[PDB]
Ligand binder design. Structure first.
Ligand code: NA
Lengths: 215, 221
């Protein structure tokens, strides 16, 4: 097969910047048979460039492709915040019509601290024997954040899961959910539920807490 | 408009089979080579198979040769993938994909998730996320729904029947130790609204034919 190797694996740049995505082939590929796709999270890939250098329909002028032989690039001349994605190259000269492994393009912005919210378990859920406590970190940048759960001031380990949204298409921030899962029995035995957040946008870590039962 | 509409995926037992369909409109389907491409959860795109305009030539990746068959029905502007002897390695979103020389950005289907598992479909429990009044301290309030204990993916969440989109964050699902998924969907809203506006999350889990609408009632002291 023709192996396509993309570089870099990850690229992080600000609006206005010029982004360069490289695609190297293990053997020569005719220009007529190199494509580039943009894939947003959880979305169908869109064709952006075909025949190495032609823009597909609807593709803005800031996207361009070039190259021949064993070296190809996709350029974004002037990045916009909506341009975050994984970009893939593909050759379609000879089967298998292999894809590169993708370059993840992330959009840089200035530091933004999270707003923190905490949600107790619902009475509906407690009827089922499990209690979920949710901590929300809203609209922050960069992605890296530490979330620690404490129950009556005891640090929890092994009983939480996190996930993070894609970047906001306009302002490039993330949000993050952390869910602590306890038995109902454990939840009802304790009073103070706290999520402590460490993030570079904060001057000091923030703790958001509730007492079980409060209005 | 150009459309490539896929069907036939979903949950399937190991060793089983699925028939994927892709109905194309808005360009001359019969003039193009077509392909299937798949993407395992969290992984890259992998080309699977392609087929000539008239069906007379086709190629497959080694790992599917002999057990997947690509075909087309030009009279119905449709592409198919017949998938047999399925394994966990085949779990992926499968896309129909037009020859890039079509030159159209929207030239792939919407995807269909194939989950190769012996487990049953299970619909979600939907619980409200309402913060305490005492813990709500300033102007913009968060609320949400916790969509817990479903299988397989995916679920869809909307707010107020699609009327509310600004400030919505529907998180990626997490697989729990139980082997069931959980997701939260949150929205931030003006505190001033909490009294005079209803917030309902609309949850659809097509695999189990489960639709739940949950009213999220705010807390006050
Ligand atoms: Na393979």
């Amino acid at each position: 097969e023709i192996v396509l190797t993309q570089s870099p694996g990850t690229l992080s740049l600000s609006p206005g910047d010029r982004a360069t995505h490289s695609c190297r082939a293990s053997q020569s590929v005719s220009r007529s048979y190199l494509a580039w796709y943009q894939q947003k999270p959880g979305q169908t890939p869109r064709l952006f460039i075909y025949g190495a250098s032609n823009r597909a329909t609807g593709i803005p002028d800031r996207f361009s492709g070039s190259g021949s032989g064993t070296y190809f690039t996709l350029t974004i001349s002037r990045l916009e915040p909506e341009d975050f994605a994984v970009y893939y190259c593909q050759q379609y000269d000879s089967a298998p019509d292999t894809f590169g492994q993708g370059t993840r393009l992330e959009i840089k912005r200035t530091v933004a601290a999270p707003s923190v919210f905490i949600f107790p378990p619902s009475d509906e859920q407690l009827k089922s024997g499990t209690a979920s406590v949710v901590c929300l970190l809203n609209n922050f940048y960069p992605r890296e954040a530490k979330v620690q759960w404490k129950v009556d001031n005891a640090l929890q380990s092994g009983n939480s899961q996190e996930s993070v949204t894609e970047q906001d298409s306009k302002d490039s921030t993330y949000s993050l959910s952390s869910t602590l899962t306890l038995s109902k029995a454990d939840y009802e035995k304790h009073k103070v539920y706290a999520c402590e957040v460490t993030h570079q946008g904060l001057s000091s870590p923030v703790t958001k807490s509730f007492n079980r039962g409060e209005c | 408009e150009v459309q490539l509409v896929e069907s036939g995926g979903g949950l399937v037992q190991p060793g089983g089979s699925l028939r994927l369909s892709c109905a194309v409109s808005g360009f001359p389907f019969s003039s193009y080579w077509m392909s299937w491409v798949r993407q395992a959860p969290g992984k890259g795109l992998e080309w699977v198979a392609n087929i000539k305009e008239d069906g007379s030539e086709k190629y497959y990746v080694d790992s599917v040769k002999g057990r997947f068959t690509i075909s087309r029905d030009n009279a119905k502007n449709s592409l198919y993938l017949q998938m047999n002897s399925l394994r966990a390695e085949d779990t992926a979103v499968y896309y129909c994909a037009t020859d890039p020389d079509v030159g159209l950005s929207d030239s792939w289907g919407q995807g269909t998730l194939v989950t190769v598992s012996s487990a049953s479909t299970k619909g979600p429990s939907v619980f409200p996320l309402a913060p305490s009044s005492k813990s709500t301290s300033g102007g913009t309030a968060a609320l949400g729904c916790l969509v817990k204990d479903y299988f397989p993916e995916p679920v869809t969440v909307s707010w107020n029947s699609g009327a509310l989109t600004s400030g919505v964050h529907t998180f990626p699902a997490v697989l729990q130790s139980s082997g069931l998924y959980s997701l939260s969907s949150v929205v931030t809203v003006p505190s001033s609204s909490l009294g005079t506006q209803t917030y309902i999350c609309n949850v659809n889990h097509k695999p189990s034919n489960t639709k739940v609408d949950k009213k999220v009632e705010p807390k006050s002291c």
